[PDB]
From Swiss-Prot, chain A:
Required for normal vault structure. Vaults are multi-subunit structures that may act as scaffolds for proteins involved in signal transduction. Vaults may also play a role in nucleo-cytoplasmic transport. Down-regulates IFNG-mediated STAT1 signaling and subsequent activation of JAK. Down-regulates SRC activity and signaling through MAP kinases. Transmembrane segments: none annotated. Phosphorylated on Tyr residues after EGF stimulation. It is found in: Cytoplasm; Nucleus. The lineage of its organism: Eukaryota, Metazoa, Chordata, Craniata, Vertebrata. The vault ribonucleoprotein particle is a huge (400 A x 670 A) cage structure of 12.9 MDa. It consists of a dimer of half-vaults, with each half-vault comprising 39 identical major vault protein (MVP) chains, PARP4 and one or more vault RNAs (vRNAs). Interacts with TEP1. Interacts with PTEN and activated MAPK1. The phosphorylated protein interacts with the SH2 domains of PTPN11 and SRC. Interacts with APEX1. May interact with ZNF540. MVP 3 mediates interaction with PTEN. MVP 4 mediates interaction with PARP4. This is Major vault protein.
Length: 139, 90, 51, 100
């Protein structure tokens, strides 16, 4: 939560990664590398109130990942391992964005941080014995 | 069906969201039990793979003999179209 | 014994499914079958005329 | 993610390669050297705003492969290994681009 101190608040279209550890309904232990493409979106750049709103959440990144892990980890617990492993792409893509099938951009209204897309790059069984069991499945 | 904010009246504090980040079985023995439950969860999926696969092979096997057996029939009748003529000569 | 009953409930619903799918199999298969036998009988009848 | 420093942003029709590590529905573990032909395209090279847009994403390569990996990796998990191995060409070439 506090491993990097900084002076300039980066608000432009960067992405930050995270490594969460989630459990499926089957009790499959999973570990994902998620990248979250993001940007702050200020409409009234000159309005001093909304400008300062940028510094409302003291740890914008923390708050963001914190919330995303909760949203994934929460929705992956209600889903079956295998069913997830076939739809991870969209399981997460919906659990992070309020579905309408999904939505495509999350707004954190306190500071104005917008998370534009999630890049699920790497998903792995945590327990070796589980990854082993799957190996025979491929065989 | 639920609510979205919890106001503490004495000091005005509001909790706006609960981010359940992690939840763990405290007893080792428990988490042991549950790891077997997943062992048997890919078991069921592994087996349902095996299953619907063998079910295919069998329907493919059905195309096989079911078509082949008819080709065979439509052959013997062609031979008969000839054998009758030969049986006239005979 | 609580995860016992749930762990066993996963097994149970799995086998019930396995069996319903099994039903799909033999069920269609044995009808694909009849619809081949009849198709062969359409040929065989003509062969029997020549025969 | 940070392995090279540079000063001029190359925008012309170069390609970059990547090696992703992806998993099929069958839980077949695969590794694919992909190349992505890419080029920035500036419709208003004169517009000072749209020029600066070019430098909007700090790690344009990172941003790119990060996305392409996610796109493939997510789509291939939905497909059978045999099926992939037979169609890789169009599976990816569809998982990366909004199919029409």
């Amino acid at each position: 939560p506090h491993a990097r101190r900084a002076l300039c608040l980066l608000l432009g279209p960067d992405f930050f990664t995270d490594v969460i550890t989630i459990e499926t309904a089957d009790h499959a232990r999973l570990q994902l590398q998620l990248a979250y493409n993001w940007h702050f979106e200020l409409k009234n750049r000159n309005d001093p109130a909304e400008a300062a709103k940028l510094f409302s959440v003291p740890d914008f990144v923390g708050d963001a990942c914190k919330a995303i892990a909760s949203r994934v980890r929460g929705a992956v617990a209600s889903v079956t391992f295998d069913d997830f492993h076939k739809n991870s792409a969209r399981i997460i893509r919906m659990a992070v964005f309020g579905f309408e099938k999904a939505r495509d951009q999350a707004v954190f209204p306190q500071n104005g941080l917008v998370v534009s897309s999630v890049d699920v790059q790497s998903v792995e069984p945590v327990d070796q014995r589980t990854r082993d069991a799957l190996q025979r499945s491929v065989q | 069906k639920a609510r979205d904010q919890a106001v503490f009246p004495q000091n005005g504090l509001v909790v706006s969201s609960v981010d359940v980040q992690s939840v763990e079985p405290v007893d080792q023995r428990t988490r042991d039990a549950l790891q077997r439950s997943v062992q048997l969860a890919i078991e069921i999926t592994t087996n349902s793979q095996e299953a619907a696969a063998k079910h295919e092979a069998q329907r493919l096997e059905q195309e096989a003999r079911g078509r082949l057996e008819r080709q065979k029939i439509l052959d013997q009748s062609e031979a008969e179209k000839a054998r009758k003529e030969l049986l006239e000569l005979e």
